[PDB]
Single-chain antibody, 233 residues
Framework: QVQLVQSGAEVKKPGASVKVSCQASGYRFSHFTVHWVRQAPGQRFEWMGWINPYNGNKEFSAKFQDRVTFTADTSANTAYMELRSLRSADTAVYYC????????????????????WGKGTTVIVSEIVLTQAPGTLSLSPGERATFSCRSSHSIRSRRVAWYQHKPGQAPRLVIHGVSNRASGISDRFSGSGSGTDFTLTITRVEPEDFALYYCQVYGASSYTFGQGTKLER
């Protein structure tokens, strides 16, 4: 099945640059745009940009356009990301993520959620807002869990997605398009909402469910994540 395998962690001095590779297997590499996303210690996930290997289109976050270069090598099934002039605030885990498969009713960009993540590569160097609640949420297997996400703008387009993260492993997509449960995701999970307030719900909690949960608004040129809700046992 679909898999994105990244290069190894690195230690870098200030001034250096770092090149992270991302090799795809289990599908046709050039038929899916790849996002690049990072997370600095105790910060929100932060989108850097995407590349579409089919036609060479690139989209860049303004925070990173000066310092980053995306490339692709379709013979090698590999996507690359290079960041120059590293500084302290560049310590982070860097992820690649493939967009979703096109939906039979989709509008332009309805599939640009992060559908499959690589495990991430750690690099150590020597305007919509989403707010989630509660910050933490303690429960025993069996109970109902309810996650909230409030947007500052109305998300008329219904491009809200929810991700599950157990640090070390790759984030998994749980819900995209507000209410669509992603493949292989249990019946226990469902999302909902509109305009400004969205919710992820788990009817009965299994032990495999304890992790962090992030909501996201996605689109063509902007992606923002909530700060995350911790589901501890």
């Amino acid at each position: 099945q679909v898999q994105l395998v990244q290069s190894g962690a690195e230690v870098k001095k200030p001034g250096a640059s770092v090149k992270v590779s991302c090799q795809a297997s289990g599908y046709r590499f050039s038929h899916f745009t790849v996002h690049w996303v990072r997370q600095a210690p105790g910060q929100r996930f932060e989108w850097m940009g995407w590349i579409n290997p089919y036609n060479g289109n690139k989209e860049f976050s303004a925070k990173f356009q000066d310092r980053v270069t995306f490339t692709a090598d379709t013979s090698a099934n590999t996507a690359y990301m290079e960041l120059r002039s590293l500084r302290s605030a560049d310590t982070a885990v860097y992820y690649c993520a493939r967009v979703g498969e096109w939906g039979w009713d989709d509008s332009p960009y309805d599939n640009y959620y992060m559908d499959v993540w690589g495990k991430g590569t750690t690099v150590i160097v020597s305007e919509i807002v989403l707010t989630q609640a509660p910050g933490t949420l303690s429960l025993s297997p069996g109970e109902r869990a309810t996650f909230s996400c409030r947007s500052s703008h109305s998300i008329r387009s219904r491009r809200v997605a929810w991700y599950q993260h157990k640090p070390g492993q790759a984030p998994r997509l749980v819900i995209h398009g507000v209410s669509n449960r992603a493949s292989g995701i249990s019946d226990r999970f469902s999302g909902s909402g509109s305009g400004t307030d969205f919710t992820l719900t788990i009817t009965r909690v299994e032990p495999e469910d304890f992790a962090l949960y992030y909501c996201q608004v996605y689109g063509a040129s902007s992606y923002t994540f909530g700060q995350g809700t911790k589901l501890e046992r």
